[PDB]
Design a protein around this nucleic acid. Sequence first.
DNA 1: GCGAAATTGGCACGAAAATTGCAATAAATAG
DNA 2: CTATTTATTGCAATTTTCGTGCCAATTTCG
Length: 316
Amino acid sequence: ELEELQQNIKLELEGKEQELALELLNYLNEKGFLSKSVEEISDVLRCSVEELEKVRQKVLRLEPLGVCSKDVWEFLELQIEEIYPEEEEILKKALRDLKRGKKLKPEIKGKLSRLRLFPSAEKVYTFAKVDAIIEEENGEFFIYLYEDFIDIDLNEEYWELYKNLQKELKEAFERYESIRKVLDIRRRNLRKVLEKIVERQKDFLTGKGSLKPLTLREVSSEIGIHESTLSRIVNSKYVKTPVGTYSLRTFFVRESAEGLTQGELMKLIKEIVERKPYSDQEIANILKEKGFKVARRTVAKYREMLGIPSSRERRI
DNA sequence: GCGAAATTGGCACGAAAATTGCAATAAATAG
DNA sequence: CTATTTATTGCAATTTTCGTGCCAATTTCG
């Protein structure tokens, strides 16, 4: 809630920014955004509009994200910049044409489902259709498929053919049983994927765990499908889980060293930091003895993403 | 202090991988 | 029944991302 934001405000903010931020949000709709403009917010606290508009852009950058922003679009625009920069080019493009009105591709609609409109379960898009489902009790681990309920829809030709009939139904069943078999292999491939990914990702779907690395090259060499055909499965197929409904491409990550997802790795560096302490190359030595071989330079980049002004400057 | 080893960041290049365009084959519809 | 264009699998090329290596710039220790 607000208590969560106020406590994080003091960590990275000092001076007027901390004094301003606490008094800065007394203006909001329970949807999370303020009814007042920066024009009015400046005159009340006896501060200029250069200070307020400067700090507000930083305040949304602290979890929980996107608090003060007035527009839904600023919240969505900040979500794409701050969260999904890899696809940020495409995602921002989906918002503009949507405002003027427009249609959306099944992939573009699903890509936008990850965004949230405003701060519990509010989300912009929820799928009417889901291409599979997965769940676990403490009991493990159920995969429904979708097409398991689906069979060839008899077209007008078969129904009207009753208008050498013994041979006619033969041919219709010949074509049908052939396509019914290929559709079984197409859905059987779905079962092969999830049964494989569940082994790694068990923690992620259930609970406390965080995403474990998975490579298409790793998976596509595990079973008959090639990575080229596997890549279009993950993009076009969506799944429901105990925690959320994800693109199926969200379960594939890249690994550094013996692990590791970039997230799990980032937390380790932040944990090791928890005058004397090691600067950079020294900290890579802790992990190499920790079982994970790393590079001296690589810890520097992850030291920049999460706040570490310096391991040296934390000494002074 | 002076010199040598270093912390840190940059420009980037390379490797491992993923996505999209291309072509070949199996298929369906129309003439 | 044959031909054309229709879609899916497999292959190749390109772009995509992420790590790491070295050198330069500022620093610390012997």
